[PDB]
Amino acid sequence: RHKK
Amino acid sequence: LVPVYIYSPEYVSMCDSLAKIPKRASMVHSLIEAYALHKQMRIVKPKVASMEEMATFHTDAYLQHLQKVSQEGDDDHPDSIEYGLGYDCPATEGIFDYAAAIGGATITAAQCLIDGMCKVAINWSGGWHHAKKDEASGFCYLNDAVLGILRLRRKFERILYVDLDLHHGDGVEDTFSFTSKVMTVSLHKFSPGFFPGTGDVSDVGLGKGRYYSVNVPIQDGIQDEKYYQICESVLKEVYQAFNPKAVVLQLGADTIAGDPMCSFNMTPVGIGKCLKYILQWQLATLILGGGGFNLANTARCWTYLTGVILGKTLSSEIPDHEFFTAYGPDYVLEITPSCRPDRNEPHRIQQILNYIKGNLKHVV
Ligand SMILES: *Nc1ccc2c(C)cc(=O)oc2c1
Ligand SMILES: [K+]
Ligand SMILES: [K+]
Ligand SMILES: [Mg+2]
Ligand SMILES: [Zn+2]
């Protein structure tokens, strides 16, 4: 999970 | 004939409440209205999506959870992290009604195309392409793009989804990864650490869907001419190989010079050329928005693109309207690219295009  | 424009005051008001883009819906519509473009379109009120309609894609567990945390805006729920709710997608009060409204709008647009009401249907407040069946992601709580594609497939045998948002259209691509009846094409920034992290050129779909996913990884700094060369090259090959019956087009404006994400360096003229290329196919086309975090520039972009859909040339002077003071310091419709480098090297772009061309050869 990356952050947008 | 005359394009459908999905709109109501209630709908805009609901879309305005998303905290990652407050008031953006109002600014977009207000500018379209200032240019009197709504008078050249068929204004259609969006239906809200029923639970059954939303559950055509999203799991009941996810939908019930969203509805649950939406009651009191419970941002501290033990199951929320599992369901993708957190920093990018906070569990705000009423968020379920918001998601139902956008899902409903894109379904309504899709239905107008099925019924032959129009050849182009526009929902600028849609395009939330990151959401998964059981997971919020990337400011997206519900995937209206998928819902629109699932509605369109009742009538259209092959559907081409084209995604010009700055980010990889992962939610839509993953949804249709295993089918050859929906081809997805995404142009996006691809760089380690950059959201969502997926969508290399080697990502082509799986099983029966192998080669029916197309990804074009692009680096910071791309401008109109090079982007259009890439997009035309790909879409020409795609149209030839896939022969779509309908198109869904996501036009997130987070690619546009002046976006705080400061990645691509596009103007709406360049995006508009891509749009024109798709429009000349004369197919049923569902137009969606997406990202775009310079709110005035996003309004500039989608207003200009609406002019493109209508075949009109718009005045360069922004007309006085509710949000006029947001359009400084120039108060013009056109956007000037930033003076920073294009990090895309010609040899790498060529390799990407060669690889994609090879992939599409299998499509028949
Ligand atoms: N993914 C992402 C990137 C940047 C953000 C800012 C500056 C504010 C915010 O609330 O959420 C963000 C999410
Ligand atoms: K994209
Ligand atoms: K596919
Ligand atoms: Mg180099
Ligand atoms: Zn985006």
Short mmCIF file of C-alpha atoms and ligand atoms in Angstrom, two decimals:
data_model
loop_
_atom_site.label_atom_id
_atom_site.label_comp_id
_atom_site.label_asym_id
_atom_site.label_seq_id
_atom_site.Cartn_x
_atom_site.Cartn_y
_atom_site.Cartn_z
CA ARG A 1 0.00 0.00 0.00
CA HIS A 2 1.33 3.38 -1.13
CA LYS A 3 -0.26 6.66 -0.12
CA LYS A 4 -1.82 8.83 -2.82
CA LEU B 1 -26.37 14.13 -31.73
CA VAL B 2 -26.50 16.28 -28.57
CA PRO B 3 -24.32 15.08 -25.66
CA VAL B 4 -25.83 14.23 -22.28
CA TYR B 5 -24.57 16.25 -19.30
CA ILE B 6 -25.14 14.52 -15.95
CA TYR B 7 -26.09 17.25 -13.48
CA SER B 8 -28.30 18.44 -10.66
CA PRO B 9 -27.73 21.01 -7.90
CA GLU B 10 -28.09 18.25 -5.28
CA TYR B 11 -25.54 16.11 -7.09
CA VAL B 12 -22.96 18.90 -7.37
CA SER B 13 -23.54 19.75 -3.71
CA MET B 14 -22.88 16.14 -2.74
CA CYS B 15 -19.74 15.91 -4.89
CA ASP B 16 -18.49 19.19 -3.36
CA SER B 17 -18.28 17.51 0.06
CA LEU B 18 -15.34 15.18 -0.70
CA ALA B 19 -12.51 16.56 1.44
CA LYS B 20 -9.70 15.83 -1.03
CA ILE B 21 -11.43 18.08 -3.60
CA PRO B 22 -13.78 20.48 -1.76
CA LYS B 23 -15.99 22.63 -4.03
CA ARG B 24 -14.40 21.27 -7.19
CA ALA B 25 -17.71 20.06 -8.63
CA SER B 26 -19.20 23.54 -8.23
CA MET B 27 -16.21 25.20 -9.84
CA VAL B 28 -16.32 22.85 -12.84
CA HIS B 29 -20.04 23.28 -13.41
CA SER B 30 -19.99 27.02 -12.73
CA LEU B 31 -17.35 27.53 -15.44
CA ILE B 32 -19.18 25.30 -17.92
CA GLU B 33 -22.31 27.35 -17.14
CA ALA B 34 -20.39 30.64 -17.49
CA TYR B 35 -19.50 29.61 -21.02
CA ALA B 36 -23.17 28.66 -21.58
CA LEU B 37 -22.18 25.16 -22.66
CA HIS B 38 -24.93 23.51 -20.65
CA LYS B 39 -27.41 25.09 -23.08
CA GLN B 40 -25.91 22.98 -25.89
CA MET B 41 -26.33 19.71 -24.01
CA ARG B 42 -29.11 17.50 -22.67
CA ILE B 43 -29.03 17.95 -18.89
CA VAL B 44 -29.91 14.70 -17.15
CA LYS B 45 -30.48 14.33 -13.42
CA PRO B 46 -28.45 11.47 -11.91
CA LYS B 47 -30.19 8.64 -10.08
CA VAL B 48 -28.68 7.48 -6.80
CA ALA B 49 -27.37 3.92 -7.01
CA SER B 50 -29.33 1.24 -5.16
CA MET B 51 -27.54 -1.25 -2.92
CA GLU B 52 -28.13 -3.91 -5.60
CA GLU B 53 -26.61 -1.71 -8.29
CA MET B 54 -23.55 -0.99 -6.14
CA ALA B 55 -23.28 -4.70 -5.30
CA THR B 56 -22.90 -5.60 -8.97
CA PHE B 57 -19.22 -4.93 -8.26
CA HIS B 58 -18.65 -4.18 -4.57
CA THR B 59 -19.01 -6.88 -1.91
CA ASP B 60 -21.87 -6.70 0.55
CA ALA B 61 -19.36 -6.79 3.40
CA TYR B 62 -17.62 -3.68 2.04
CA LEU B 63 -20.87 -1.84 1.28
CA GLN B 64 -22.33 -2.60 4.72
CA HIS B 65 -19.11 -1.43 6.36
CA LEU B 66 -19.14 1.81 4.37
CA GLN B 67 -22.78 2.38 5.30
CA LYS B 68 -21.93 1.61 8.93
CA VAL B 69 -19.05 4.06 9.32
CA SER B 70 -21.00 6.64 7.30
CA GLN B 71 -23.67 7.00 10.00
CA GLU B 72 -21.55 8.81 12.60
CA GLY B 73 -18.34 9.23 10.59
CA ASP B 74 -16.54 6.52 12.56
CA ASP B 75 -12.89 6.93 11.57
CA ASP B 76 -11.68 4.66 14.38
CA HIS B 77 -13.35 1.39 13.36
CA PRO B 78 -11.30 -1.84 13.88
CA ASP B 79 -12.16 -3.12 10.39
CA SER B 80 -11.54 0.13 8.48
CA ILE B 81 -7.87 -0.45 7.61
CA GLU B 82 -8.83 -3.81 6.07
CA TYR B 83 -11.39 -1.95 3.95
CA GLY B 84 -8.91 0.72 2.80
CA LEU B 85 -10.34 3.52 4.91
CA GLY B 86 -7.68 5.77 6.40
CA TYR B 87 -5.63 8.79 5.32
CA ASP B 88 -6.48 8.76 1.59
CA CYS B 89 -10.08 7.62 2.17
CA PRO B 90 -11.32 8.85 5.54
CA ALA B 91 -14.61 7.50 6.90
CA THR B 92 -16.46 10.80 6.82
CA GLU B 93 -20.06 11.39 7.84
CA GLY B 94 -22.37 10.65 4.90
CA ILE B 95 -19.63 9.16 2.73
CA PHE B 96 -21.87 6.24 1.74
CA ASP B 97 -24.49 8.63 0.32
CA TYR B 98 -21.69 10.39 -1.56
CA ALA B 99 -20.47 7.14 -3.11
CA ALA B 100 -24.01 6.04 -3.99
CA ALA B 101 -24.58 9.38 -5.71
CA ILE B 102 -21.47 9.14 -7.93
CA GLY B 103 -22.05 5.49 -8.74
CA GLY B 104 -25.61 6.36 -9.67
CA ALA B 105 -24.51 9.24 -11.89
CA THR B 106 -22.18 7.11 -13.99
CA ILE B 107 -24.77 4.35 -14.24
CA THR B 108 -27.31 6.99 -15.37
CA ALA B 109 -24.83 8.16 -18.03
CA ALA B 110 -24.23 4.58 -19.15
CA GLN B 111 -27.98 4.01 -19.42
CA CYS B 112 -28.38 7.09 -21.66
CA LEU B 113 -25.83 5.55 -24.04
CA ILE B 114 -27.58 2.15 -24.01
CA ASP B 115 -30.92 3.82 -24.80
CA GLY B 116 -29.40 5.74 -27.72
CA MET B 117 -30.27 9.05 -26.06
CA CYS B 118 -26.84 10.34 -27.13
CA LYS B 119 -23.46 9.31 -28.50
CA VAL B 120 -21.59 11.05 -25.65
CA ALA B 121 -22.57 11.17 -21.99
CA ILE B 122 -20.58 13.25 -19.51
CA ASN B 123 -20.10 12.82 -15.79
CA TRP B 124 -17.26 15.13 -14.77
CA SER B 125 -17.68 14.19 -11.10
CA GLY B 126 -16.98 10.52 -11.84
CA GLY B 127 -13.92 8.44 -12.69
CA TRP B 128 -12.96 7.03 -9.28
CA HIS B 129 -10.83 4.34 -10.82
CA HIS B 130 -8.78 3.08 -7.85
CA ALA B 131 -11.53 1.45 -5.74
CA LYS B 132 -11.64 -2.35 -5.51
CA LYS B 133 -14.60 -4.65 -4.86
CA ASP B 134 -13.82 -4.72 -1.14
CA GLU B 135 -11.45 -1.82 -0.65
CA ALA B 136 -11.41 1.99 -0.78
CA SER B 137 -8.26 3.37 -2.39
CA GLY B 138 -6.80 6.60 -3.70
CA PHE B 139 -9.69 8.92 -2.72
CA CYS B 140 -12.06 6.41 -4.33
CA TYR B 141 -14.73 4.71 -2.20
CA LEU B 142 -16.77 3.22 -4.99
CA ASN B 143 -15.62 2.47 -8.51
CA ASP B 144 -18.16 4.25 -10.73
CA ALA B 145 -16.01 3.47 -13.76
CA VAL B 146 -16.47 -0.26 -13.23
CA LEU B 147 -20.20 0.21 -12.55
CA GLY B 148 -20.56 2.13 -15.81
CA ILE B 149 -18.66 -0.53 -17.75
CA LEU B 150 -20.81 -3.29 -16.20
CA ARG B 151 -23.95 -1.38 -17.27
CA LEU B 152 -22.64 -0.77 -20.79
CA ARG B 153 -21.82 -4.45 -21.32
CA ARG B 154 -25.53 -5.31 -21.27
CA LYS B 155 -25.57 -3.78 -24.76
CA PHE B 156 -21.98 -3.49 -26.02
CA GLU B 157 -19.95 -6.67 -26.62
CA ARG B 158 -16.49 -5.09 -26.49
CA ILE B 159 -15.75 -2.02 -24.39
CA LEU B 160 -12.53 -0.02 -24.48
CA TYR B 161 -11.60 1.84 -21.29
CA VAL B 162 -9.02 4.59 -21.80
CA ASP B 163 -7.54 6.20 -18.69
CA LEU B 164 -5.62 9.48 -19.01
CA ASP B 165 -5.46 10.28 -15.27
CA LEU B 166 -1.96 10.92 -13.85
CA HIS B 167 -2.27 7.67 -11.86
CA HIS B 168 -2.54 4.04 -12.97
CA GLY B 169 -6.15 2.95 -13.44
CA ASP B 170 -5.50 -0.11 -11.28
CA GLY B 171 -9.01 -0.72 -9.92
CA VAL B 172 -10.60 -0.92 -13.35
CA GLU B 173 -7.70 -2.87 -14.86
CA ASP B 174 -7.67 -5.45 -12.06
CA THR B 175 -11.46 -5.87 -12.26
CA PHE B 176 -11.29 -6.82 -15.93
CA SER B 177 -7.86 -8.49 -15.92
CA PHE B 178 -9.29 -11.91 -16.80
CA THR B 179 -11.58 -10.95 -19.68
CA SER B 180 -11.04 -10.13 -23.34
CA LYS B 181 -14.40 -8.35 -23.56
CA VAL B 182 -13.13 -5.19 -21.85
CA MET B 183 -9.76 -3.80 -22.86
CA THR B 184 -8.14 -1.27 -20.51
CA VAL B 185 -5.51 1.25 -21.61
CA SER B 186 -3.83 3.47 -19.01
CA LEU B 187 -1.18 6.19 -19.54
CA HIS B 188 0.26 7.24 -16.20
CA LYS B 189 3.28 8.20 -14.18
CA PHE B 190 5.23 5.11 -13.18
CA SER B 191 8.05 5.55 -10.68
CA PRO B 192 9.06 3.73 -7.45
CA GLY B 193 7.11 5.17 -4.54
CA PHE B 194 4.51 6.82 -6.79
CA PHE B 195 0.88 5.80 -6.17
CA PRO B 196 -0.41 3.17 -6.67
CA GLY B 197 2.86 1.53 -7.73
CA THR B 198 1.46 -0.69 -10.49
CA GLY B 199 1.06 -0.58 -14.25
CA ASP B 200 4.39 -1.36 -15.88
CA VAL B 201 4.37 -2.01 -19.64
CA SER B 202 4.84 -5.73 -18.93
CA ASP B 203 1.49 -5.79 -17.08
CA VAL B 204 -0.85 -7.14 -19.74
CA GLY B 205 -3.68 -8.96 -17.95
CA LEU B 206 -4.11 -12.64 -17.12
CA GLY B 207 -5.76 -15.81 -18.43
CA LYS B 208 -8.30 -15.12 -21.19
CA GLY B 209 -7.58 -11.44 -20.61
CA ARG B 210 -3.90 -11.77 -21.46
CA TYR B 211 -2.91 -8.83 -23.74
CA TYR B 212 -6.23 -7.08 -23.06
CA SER B 213 -4.66 -4.74 -20.50
CA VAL B 214 -2.34 -2.04 -21.89
CA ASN B 215 -0.11 0.14 -19.70
CA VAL B 216 2.09 3.06 -20.75
CA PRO B 217 4.52 4.03 -17.95
CA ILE B 218 5.55 7.70 -18.33
CA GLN B 219 8.04 9.88 -16.42
CA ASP B 220 7.75 13.40 -14.99
CA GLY B 221 7.66 16.39 -17.31
CA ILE B 222 5.81 15.14 -20.38
CA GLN B 223 4.25 17.88 -22.51
CA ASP B 224 1.42 17.98 -25.08
CA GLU B 225 3.23 16.97 -28.27
CA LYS B 226 5.06 13.90 -26.97
CA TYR B 227 2.01 12.72 -24.99
CA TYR B 228 -0.22 12.92 -28.03
CA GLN B 229 2.32 11.03 -30.17
CA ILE B 230 2.31 8.22 -27.60
CA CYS B 231 -1.46 8.22 -27.11
CA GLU B 232 -2.24 8.28 -30.84
CA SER B 233 0.28 5.51 -31.52
CA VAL B 234 -1.24 3.26 -28.88
CA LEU B 235 -4.92 4.01 -29.60
CA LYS B 236 -4.48 3.53 -33.34
CA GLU B 237 -3.13 0.03 -32.72
CA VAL B 238 -5.74 -0.69 -30.07
CA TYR B 239 -8.71 0.40 -32.22
CA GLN B 240 -7.41 -1.73 -35.07
CA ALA B 241 -6.91 -4.86 -32.97
CA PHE B 242 -9.81 -4.66 -30.53
CA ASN B 243 -12.59 -3.06 -32.60
CA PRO B 244 -14.47 -1.63 -29.61
CA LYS B 245 -18.26 -1.17 -29.66
CA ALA B 246 -18.16 1.51 -26.96
CA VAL B 247 -15.61 3.58 -25.04
CA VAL B 248 -15.26 4.74 -21.42
CA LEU B 249 -12.77 7.59 -21.11
CA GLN B 250 -11.34 8.81 -17.81
CA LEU B 251 -9.84 12.29 -18.05
CA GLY B 252 -8.37 13.04 -14.63
CA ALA B 253 -6.79 16.48 -14.79
CA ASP B 254 -3.95 15.75 -12.35
CA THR B 255 -1.68 15.62 -15.45
CA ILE B 256 -2.14 19.33 -16.08
CA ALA B 257 0.62 21.91 -15.49
CA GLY B 258 -0.03 23.66 -12.22
CA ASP B 259 -1.29 20.59 -10.39
CA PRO B 260 0.28 20.47 -6.92
CA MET B 261 1.38 16.92 -7.68
CA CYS B 262 3.69 18.63 -10.18
CA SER B 263 4.45 15.49 -12.19
CA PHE B 264 3.29 15.73 -15.80
CA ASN B 265 3.38 19.06 -17.65
CA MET B 266 0.31 18.83 -19.91
CA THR B 267 -2.25 21.39 -21.02
CA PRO B 268 -5.89 20.72 -21.84
CA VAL B 269 -5.10 21.26 -25.54
CA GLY B 270 -2.94 18.12 -25.54
CA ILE B 271 -5.54 16.07 -23.70
CA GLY B 272 -8.13 17.51 -26.10
CA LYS B 273 -6.28 16.10 -29.10
CA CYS B 274 -6.42 12.64 -27.51
CA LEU B 275 -10.13 13.18 -26.89
CA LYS B 276 -10.70 14.27 -30.50
CA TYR B 277 -8.97 11.12 -31.75
CA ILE B 278 -11.34 8.96 -29.71
CA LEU B 279 -14.40 11.02 -30.70
CA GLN B 280 -13.77 10.57 -34.42
CA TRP B 281 -14.44 6.82 -33.92
CA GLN B 282 -18.13 7.81 -33.57
CA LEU B 283 -18.80 5.27 -30.81
CA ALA B 284 -20.97 5.48 -27.72
CA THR B 285 -18.63 7.23 -25.28
CA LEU B 286 -18.88 7.73 -21.54
CA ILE B 287 -16.74 10.67 -20.38
CA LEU B 288 -15.52 10.72 -16.77
CA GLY B 289 -13.34 13.04 -14.67
CA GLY B 290 -10.98 11.81 -11.95
CA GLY B 291 -8.08 13.43 -10.15
CA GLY B 292 -7.15 17.08 -10.48
CA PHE B 293 -5.98 19.06 -7.48
CA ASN B 294 -5.58 22.55 -8.84
CA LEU B 295 -9.29 23.19 -8.76
CA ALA B 296 -9.39 26.15 -11.14
CA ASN B 297 -7.15 24.36 -13.64
CA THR B 298 -9.32 21.25 -13.47
CA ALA B 299 -12.34 23.44 -14.21
CA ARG B 300 -10.36 25.08 -17.06
CA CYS B 301 -9.48 21.67 -18.43
CA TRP B 302 -12.88 20.01 -18.31
CA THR B 303 -14.61 23.16 -19.56
CA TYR B 304 -12.23 23.23 -22.53
CA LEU B 305 -12.80 19.51 -23.14
CA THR B 306 -16.56 20.06 -23.05
CA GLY B 307 -16.03 22.68 -25.76
CA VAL B 308 -14.10 20.03 -27.70
CA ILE B 309 -17.01 17.57 -27.39
CA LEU B 310 -19.36 20.29 -28.69
CA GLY B 311 -17.01 21.34 -31.50
CA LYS B 312 -16.91 24.90 -30.18
CA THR B 313 -14.07 27.37 -29.82
CA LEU B 314 -14.26 29.05 -26.41
CA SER B 315 -13.23 32.60 -25.63
CA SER B 316 -9.84 32.82 -23.96
CA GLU B 317 -11.13 35.31 -21.38
CA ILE B 318 -12.66 33.61 -18.34
CA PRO B 319 -16.16 35.10 -17.90
CA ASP B 320 -17.11 36.66 -14.57
CA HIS B 321 -18.89 34.07 -12.41
CA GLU B 322 -19.05 32.88 -8.79
CA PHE B 323 -15.45 31.70 -8.70
CA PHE B 324 -13.89 34.30 -11.04
CA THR B 325 -11.32 35.45 -8.45
CA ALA B 326 -9.85 31.92 -8.38
CA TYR B 327 -8.60 32.36 -11.97
CA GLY B 328 -5.73 34.76 -11.36
CA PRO B 329 -3.32 36.10 -12.10
CA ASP B 330 -4.11 35.78 -15.85
CA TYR B 331 -7.87 35.05 -15.94
CA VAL B 332 -7.56 33.10 -19.17
CA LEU B 333 -8.72 29.63 -20.17
CA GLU B 334 -5.34 28.47 -21.51
CA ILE B 335 -2.72 26.91 -19.23
CA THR B 336 0.98 27.54 -19.71
CA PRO B 337 3.36 24.61 -19.18
CA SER B 338 5.94 24.94 -16.38
CA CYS B 339 9.62 25.43 -17.24
CA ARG B 340 10.88 22.11 -15.98
CA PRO B 341 12.54 19.20 -17.83
CA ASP B 342 10.82 16.35 -19.62
CA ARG B 343 12.38 13.27 -18.03
CA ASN B 344 11.12 10.99 -20.83
CA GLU B 345 13.92 9.79 -23.07
CA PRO B 346 13.01 9.08 -26.72
CA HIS B 347 14.66 5.65 -26.68
CA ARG B 348 12.66 4.46 -23.68
CA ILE B 349 9.39 5.74 -25.12
CA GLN B 350 10.16 3.90 -28.36
CA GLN B 351 10.83 0.67 -26.44
CA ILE B 352 7.51 0.98 -24.63
CA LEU B 353 5.70 1.55 -27.91
CA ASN B 354 7.47 -1.45 -29.53
CA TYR B 355 6.52 -3.69 -26.62
CA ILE B 356 2.87 -2.65 -26.69
CA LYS B 357 2.71 -3.10 -30.46
CA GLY B 358 4.05 -6.63 -30.03
CA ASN B 359 1.44 -7.33 -27.35
CA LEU B 360 -1.47 -6.17 -29.50
CA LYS B 361 -0.43 -8.55 -32.27
CA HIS B 362 -1.87 -11.34 -30.13
CA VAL B 363 -5.18 -9.47 -29.99
CA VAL B 364 -7.45 -10.84 -32.73
N1 LIG C 1 -2.14 10.75 -1.37
C1 LIG C 1 -2.10 12.05 -0.89
C2 LIG C 1 -1.13 13.02 -1.20
C3 LIG C 1 -1.14 14.30 -0.65
C4 LIG C 1 -2.14 14.65 0.26
C5 LIG C 1 -2.24 15.99 0.91
C6 LIG C 1 -1.22 17.04 0.59
C7 LIG C 1 -3.29 16.22 1.80
C8 LIG C 1 -4.23 15.21 2.06
O1 LIG C 1 -5.18 15.39 2.86
O2 LIG C 1 -4.15 13.97 1.48
C9 LIG C 1 -3.16 13.65 0.60
C10 LIG C 1 -3.10 12.38 0.03
K K C 2 -4.08 6.79 -16.19
K K C 3 -9.07 -6.89 -19.84
MG MG C 4 19.09 8.36 -19.13
ZN ZN C 5 -5.07 10.60 -10.30
#
